[PDB]
Ligand binder design. Structure first.
Ligand SMILES: C[C@@H](c1cccc2c(-c3ccc(CS(C)(=O)=O)c(F)c3)c(C(=O)O)[nH]c12)N1C[C@@H](CNC(=N)N)OC1=O
Ligand SMILES: [Zn+2]
Ligand SMILES: [Zn+2]
Length: 230
């Protein structure tokens, strides 16, 4: 019943966690440069179908994700959105595409994934190229807050449940640094978080890209750790 943690999930297994009615997170673990990390995604019920947000960080993890969804939920995943171009978001897109899932990302994410050799979602999401832009996508709103963890990062809001999925632009409360900043804009990140805070003041649950969900405090904590990292 507790939120599944990095040392509790072997690499290759996936667990789901019920966030709200018709909203789950998915949690998996992966090795990278000789360390093991957890990572989150989202699942949102879309009538008798499911919308997936982000892969489970790798092909085998993402196959295991689809199997876990079939076991725990039993509705088909028909569409997926990747919230930026890194492997914890797009690694597994080829698995999804071979399982009948239509895969989407912004044009900026698709360009970055292609240039860096990561898997590439099929469909481009227009209407998200300027910070503050928002578009509807099934049961969610997609929001581009500006550059933060990456220049292309998107956040996702579930209006029926007031769930804010921050992706990797948002860190968990226990975080001590800004995570993997390889592609980050540390100077712009606080401004982008402020845009999230201003656009989603009624969020009740905030889910980071890695680690434990909480409330709105994750946003301020993120700004604090990024400012101090910088
Ligand atoms: C795939 C992804 C990646 C790989 C490994 C780790 C991360 C973490 C991380 C680390 C640490 C923490 C804990 S904490 C907050 O600092 O206390 C965390 F919570 C998230 C994050 C994140 O922060 O989102 N992402 C990671 N990758 C590749 C990559 C390309 N690297 C290049 N050199 N090109 O960039 C990147 O992010
Ligand atoms: Zn990333
Ligand atoms: Zn990440």
């Amino acid at each position: 019943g507790e939120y599944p943690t990095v040392n509790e999930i072997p690499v290759g297994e996936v667990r789901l966690y019920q966030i709200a009615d018709g909203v789950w997170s998915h949690i998996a673990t992966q090795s990278f440069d000789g360390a093991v990390y957890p990572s989150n995604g989202l699942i949102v019920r879309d009538g008798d179908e499911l919308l997936l947000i982000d892969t489970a960080w790798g092909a085998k993890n993402t196959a295991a994700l689809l199997a876990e969804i079939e076991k725990q939920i039993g509705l088909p995943v028909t569409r997926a959105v990747s919230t930026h171009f890194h492997d914890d978001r797009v690694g597994g897109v080829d698995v999804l595409r071979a399982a009948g899932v239509a895969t989407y990302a912004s044009p900026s994410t698709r360009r970055l994934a292609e240039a860096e050799g990561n898997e590439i979602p099929t469909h481009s999401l227009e209407g998200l190229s300027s910070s503050g832009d928002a578009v509807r996508f099934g049961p969610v709103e997609l929001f581009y807050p500006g550059a933060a963890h990456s220049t292309d990062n998107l956040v996702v809001y579930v209006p029926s449940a007031n769930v804010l999925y921050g992706g990797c632009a948002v860190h968990e409360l226990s975080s001590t640094s800004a995570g993997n900043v390889a592609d980050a804009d540390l100077a712009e990140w606080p401004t982008s978080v402020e845009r999230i805070q201003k656009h989603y003041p009624e969020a009740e649950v905030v889910i980071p890209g890695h680690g434990l969900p909480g409330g709105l405090d994750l946003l301020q904590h993120t700004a604090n750790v990024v400012k101090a990292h910088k």
